[PDB]
Write a protein that binds this ligand. Structure first.
Ligand SMILES: Cc1ncsc1-c1ccc([C@H](C)NC(=O)[C@@H]2C[C@@H](O)CN2C(=O)[C@@H](c2cc(O[C@@H](C)CN3CC[C@@H](N4CCN5c6cc(-c7ccccc7O)nnc6NC[C@H]5C4)C3)no2)C(C)C)cc1
Ligand SMILES: Cc1ncsc1-c1ccc([C@H](C)NC(=O)[C@@H]2C[C@@H](O)CN2C(=O)[C@@H](c2cc(O[C@@H](C)CN3CC[C@@H](N4CCN5c6cc(-c7ccccc7O)nnc6NC[C@H]5C4)C3)no2)C(C)C)cc1
Lengths: 89, 109, 104, 150, 151, 89, 104, 148, 87, 92, 103
């Protein structure tokens, strides 16, 4: 597991492999391994959803049946796009 | 350097876990496409542990950071292809952790 | 099937999966593994209702269609202090800014 | 023209099955490997279509021109039918990158003249402006196909 | 054996997609043409499976042994794979006759030893007791193949 | 184009001719040709559902798309089975 | 997309399909074709609410997954008697016998 | 911990159902997720193609009641010696009188009617707690972490 | 030795001590060759013994075990008795 | 496809071809080498014996390569000797 | 799972069929072999006529009494014009008295 910490200071414990979906996190962890990474400019309502994507990507990559749309509400769209860009994904 | 590359790469291969079993036994030579076509379609850069010693015998690797970049690539190629919690998945997680401790002992001591 | 969960206590939020068929107890064991506190010091709630260690996540209400990977179901966590258990307290996530007029 | 249909003259009955939320634009590559738009499949619809063996197809969101997948892959080429049994093309959403997916949503909410009003980096603004495109993607697929493997 | 797999030694990657509400029993016809049960597909799942070119498959409700369809027909035989792309087997409910469908429901509600207690005609009781069956259906499918190969 | 099926209790069901013909028994009774047919032993809660099947069968026969289960409630199952057999649906 | 309907007045029940995009007026015309009474002598209800001739069945609430062929959505019908419309009256279908003991 | 091991070495096996019940063979996959396989009627035996190190488990297809294979709960075929097949003998365990009674009551009474039986509340819960591969897998893990 | 279990209706059941001990609740009570069950009738306690016979005999038997039969008529009362006994 | 075995006393036994072939002597007699012979006639084998010889074909075909348990093929004393004779002649 | 000897006069057919299969399906198997259509054949279990619609199971034939080594006997009669041929199964050759060696 790995600990991602939002600006407001929420802690998110997610599987290491799930997190590594983010090239930028891969860099921060792979370059001195530690367990924590701190995002001073990403709020919780965003970093929460960024994790939810890791869950989604990990689960539905290489899925034979059918894949469901990864939903993004208008209210969060812009800040998520920012966060998404800053992280590789 | 080539001797250290041989040490780092031979320590990761020779490495046995705490039940006596060698982990690299599957990572020694890749499967033929005829055998397993799904792996080749899924994996961009099929590389094994002989393909890396071959490079090292050719000294294709320049620094110890270029040898590491392609040991992480196969160990991550394995993770992508295999099921999470598979025998082969968690050993490529250990082979990355035994390569990162093997390079840290030889390159600075 | 698979159920996707956020187990949250205070400002801590654990992202993990389990099976519909798996039990509230094994979920406490996953928490034990991370937060280093045994299943007898943990209370797990779905909303405000306490979950019995013996019931399957399925029976608790976590279906595949309410515990999706991108819409994880939230299990609340409480730890034991001596004779009493702390209140279930899940500090809310940061609010998003008022919807910009550009998106209306 | 690496990526192109092949003049077979052997018919291949196919079933286009749209299991994406999106309206689907089936795109037939011509023998000169030129994309040719075909009638749209509504979401959750399936149609029997007359195509030929070796003909190469590609699918996309008729609206956004976003990339879709058929049978877990980017290209569909009908096999020769066995015993008249129709071949099946199962069209689905791919796992979009969170970024590309966000772009999709922002693009869908904000008028292109207002991309300039978003407090984002200029590189992101260019990415917002850079609509997805069949031709760009075809060029990419050729270099990935000219590499014997992927 | 009109309906049987053909030993080929050329692999064919396939995707079994269960688009029925039922648990699906994939049934591979062997070279002699004897049904061979394979692992079940839960409703709404899809799995990549290794089969060979010319191999003949059939699908059924793992519980009731009710007849299903694959690519809107009764038998599936993987085409030769092109470019590594996997073939797709879309498994669904057929349009059952209202009768056969009713039988299914009655059969699902009443224990087989009690079919005898239902205040219905004996002929209906016989129909209830005649559980659907891969082999009976295979025999029928053969005569339906010798009937479009007679003419 | 339309035809009238009348239940025992005396409900009238107006359904497309071709939809009704899905029943051999009805095909026989209609095959000039009449507009009404009366079922003295079929109640409405049954003949209603028999029509719903015609709707279903006509629509989903020859559909490439996945077909949905034709539902039958326990309470109706036996009488429907009776009606079904008489009709040849 | 198609919607499957039961248009019911009293003891009459009409089974027909129509497009989500088609209009309440077009439906009145179909009824005219069968029951020989013009659209100006008809009122069409979805449950207890009157449907305006100009709205699409879609906008009225009839959809792909509430108006399925085997679960047709019910449109209520009322005819005009001189100055006033009759009350919407849909005489219910016959009740099924209590479950025989084997199925209980 | 409890999962098959990708092996590449075939191990032919004989599943012999010497229980009075229809048997559901359950193969643990590499990730260690139970996979239901075709059922064995009572008093039948089949030769099945499996691989070395593959972990199997057997159960009453109808009730999901626990069975035994070679007097234990898990079966893992050894490497074949001289091509001869390994044998998996599937049998009833000796159920507790309680668990056995539950089995019978569960088989006679619809789950919604467990509430109508003039029994203790604890028994209602026991009746409702139907046996389950996953619950049993969790137990078997803790029984292997207790042997370490 | 042997042990005496006595049913509500007052039937006496003499069974081997080790057979009886299969019941945690009996094990507790004998920890004395008599135990009285005011709420267990004979047709039940008779069958409870038959289980002891069965369990003792077939536990650790390699080849084959036969299903311990319970008739519908006795099933509920046996389940009650079973739970009380811990057998 | 079936085959006809005819006993001394002239009983006809229709058994599957594959069932019969379990006998080397029969295989030899069946396998003019342009096409197959349906009848074979046993001058010295009575019915009560040839009947049981078939029952063995049924048994052998069914239980060969059957995994859990095979039952003993019963032979009554009254028939044992004549069957042994017939058995050796047939090579079954 | 049921093993049968279907015997008419001096002809005996050795064959299997399912407990769940029907007396009619059996007539069809006979049709396939002896080239005699299903409706003129009459099948008996001992001295009782079997209805085309009943399953072999419900007629009395079970796996435990119709084993491959001890096949159950179904009697067969054909139809000439209006009349029914009598159930005639001419018995097999008789075994010699038990030799004094075996007593
Ligand atoms: C009728 C009836 N009744 C009651 S039950 C029943 C019944 C039972 C069974 C069946 C069917 C027919 N049988 C089964 O279901 C059986 C049962 C159970 O035992 C599993 N199984 C299966 O079929 C699984 C299965 C098959 C398989 O075969 C491998 C050896 C083939 N694999 C590719 C070759 C090697 N792999 C080679 C690359 N190797 C990898 C290497 C690397 C790697 C190495 C170096 C560097 C980088 C790398 O990435 N990475 N990944 C690799 N992955 C594969 C690994 C080994 C093995 N194995 O399992 C199927 C179902 C999943 C029918 C009826
Ligand atoms: C409802 C709905 N919803 C969602 S989708 C949809 C839908 C889908 C399909 C259809 C309709 C019914 N179906 C289609 O549109 C299908 C589909 C797709 O598979 C292509 N296609 C077509 O119809 C093309 C088509 C192709 C072709 O094959 C030849 C036999 C037809 N013609 C004879 C002869 C040939 N030419 C072949 C070169 N040839 C020459 C070659 C050369 C040459 C070649 C190699 C090297 C050197 C050379 O010099 N030189 N000169 C040539 N001159 C002659 C030329 C002849 C073409 N049949 O149809 C059509 C569109 C092109 C509807 C709805």
């Amino acid at each position: 597991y790995v600990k991602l910490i939002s600006s407001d200071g929420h802690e998110f414990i997610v599987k290491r492999e799930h997190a590594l979906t983010s090239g930028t996190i891969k860099a921060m962890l792979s370059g001195p391994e530690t367990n924590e990474v701190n995002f001073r400019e990403i709020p919780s309502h965003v970093l929460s959803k960024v994790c939810m994507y890791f869950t989604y990507k990990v689960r539905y990559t290489n899925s034979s049946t059918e894949i469901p749309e990864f939903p993004i509400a208008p209210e969060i769209a812009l800040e998520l796009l920012m966060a998404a860009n800053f992280l590789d994904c | 350097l080539t001797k250290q590359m041989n040490a780092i790469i031979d320590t990761v291969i020779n490495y046995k876990d705490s039940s006596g079993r060698q982990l690299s036994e599957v990572f020694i030579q890749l499967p033929s496409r005829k055998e397993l076509p799904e792996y080749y379609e899924l994996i961009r850069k099929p590389v094994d542990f002989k393909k890396i010693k071959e490079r090292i015998r050719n000294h294709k690797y320049r620094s110890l950071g270029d040898l590491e970049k392609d040991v992480m690539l196969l160990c991550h190629n394995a993770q992508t292809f295999n099921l999470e919690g598979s025998q082969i998945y968690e050993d490529s997680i250990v082979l990355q952790s035994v390569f990162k401790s093997a390079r840290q002992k030889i390159a600075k001591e | 099937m698979d159920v996707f969960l956020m187990i949250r206590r205070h400002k801590t939020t654990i992202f993990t999966d389990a099976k519909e068929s798996s039990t509230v107890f094994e979920l406490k064991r996953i928490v034990e593994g991370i937060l280093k506190r045994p299943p007898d010091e943990q209370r797990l709630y779905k909303d405000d209702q306490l979950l019995d260690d013996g019931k399957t996540l399925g029976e608790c209400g976590f279906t595949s269609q309410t515990a999706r990977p991108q819409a994880p179901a939230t299990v609340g966590l409480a730890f034991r202090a001596d004779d009493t258990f702390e209140a279930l307290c899940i500090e809310p996530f940061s609010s998003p800014p008022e919807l910009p007029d550009v998106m209306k | 023209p690496v990526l192109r249909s092949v003049n077979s003259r052997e018919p291949s009955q196919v079933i286009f099955c749209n299991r994406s939320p999106r309206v689907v634009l089936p795109v037939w590559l011509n023998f000169d490997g030129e994309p040719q738009p075909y009638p749209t499949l509504p979401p959750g619809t399936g149609r029997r279509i007359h195509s030929y063996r070796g003909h190469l197809w590609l699918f996309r969101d008729a609206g956004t021109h976003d990339g879709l997948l058929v049978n877990q892959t980017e290209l569909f080429v009908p096999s020769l039918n066995v015993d008249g049994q129709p071949i099946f093309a199962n069209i689905t959403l791919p796992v979009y990158t969170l970024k590309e997916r966000c772009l999709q949503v922002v693009r869908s909410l904000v008028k292109p003249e207002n991309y300039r009003r978003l407090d984002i980096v200029r590189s992101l603004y260019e990415d917002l402006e850079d609509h997805p495109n069949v031709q760009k993607d075809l060029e990419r697929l050729t270099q990935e196909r000219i590499a014997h493997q992927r």
